[PDB]
């Protein structure tokens, strides 16, 4: 259930242009895991709610991990790619904490 | 040759937003077509490049068709979809007009599937100025 | 002679596709996988500050 969460990170939903503009990600949750409610759900974040998230990972586990977040635009542009790192930095991020069980709480 | 081009529309490097951004998709063409140059090219149009084109298509085929476009934002935003829709629209367009052997002929086209500057750059060099 | 020089303007308009195709294929997999060890052992050292 825990490692056993089932994540795609999908829909870019990429809000077009304006320099600094963020993706907005389905991230369909298809869970087994009992670590989250919805066999199936899907929110369409935006990358600063996951960055924050990402800190919140952090802020409450107290030393208790917290991986790299989504994608950093720190040298990223907007790229497909980038965003693709970013979808894929979560999805990574996300991932792993799905498999261990106490990022996966929060 | 003619219907044998053989086209992927992907790469979706769509530039992100300003409201009205355009995508710019590798236009692959693998074609083994005879009416395209290299064996693959890809080249890298933006959305307002293809329109032109698809007009170009039309202007130089002179009732000789001109199918739909890459796809409008006239009810597009600027969508996955609705870029996707684009990039099925020239796919579509394309893929056509390549199985039509006249519009496969326009050598802007040859130039630019086969050439990533636009189609612009092309439309001058071709009549010569 | 005109078909031979264009023969070879085929080989080099290919050779410049496949060369710039595979900085996408190797080169990126690579810097992806360092890009994402330096923010991971960007991480234990916030957690070794939590630690002391």
Do not use: C
């Amino acid at each position: 259930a825990r490692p056993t969460f089932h994540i795609t990170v999908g829909d870019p939903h990429k809000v077009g242009d304006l320099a600094t503009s963020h993706i907005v990600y389905s991230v369909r949750t298809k869970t087994t895991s009992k670590a989250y409610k919805q066999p199936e759900f899907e929110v369409k974040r935006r990358y600063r709610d996951f960055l924050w998230l990402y800190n919140t990972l952090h802020s409450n586990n107290p030393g208790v991990v917290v991986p790299p977040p989504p994608e950093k635009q720190a040298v990223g542009r907007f790229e497909s790619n980038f965003v693709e790192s970013r979808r894929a930095a979560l999805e990574k991020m996300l991932n792993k904490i799905a498999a261990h069980p106490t990022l996966q709480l929060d | 040759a003619r219907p044998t081009f053989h086209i992927t529309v992907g790469d979706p490097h769509k530039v992100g937003d300003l409201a009205t951004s355009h995508i710019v998709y590798s236009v692959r063409t693998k074609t083994t077509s005879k009416a395209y140059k290299q064996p693959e090219f890809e080249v890298k149009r933006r959305y307002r490049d293809f329109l032109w084109l698809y007009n170009t298509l039309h202007s130089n085929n002179p009732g000789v068709v001109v199918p739909p476009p890459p796809e409008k934002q006239a009810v597009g935003r600027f969508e996955s979809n609705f870029v996707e829709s684009r990039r099925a629209a020239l796919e579509k367009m394309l893929n056509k007009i390549a199985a039509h052997p006249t519009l496969q002929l326009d050598a802007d086209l040859k130039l630019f599937l086969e050439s990533e500057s636009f189609n612009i750059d092309v439309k001058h060099k071709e009549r010569k100025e | 002679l005109s078909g031979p020089l264009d023969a070879l303007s085929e080989l080099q308009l290919a050779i410049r596709d496949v060369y710039e195709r595979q900085a996408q294929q190797d080169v990126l997999t690579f810097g992806i996988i360092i890009e994402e060890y330096i923010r991971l052992i960007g991480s234990v050292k916030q957690a070794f500050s939590q630690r002391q």
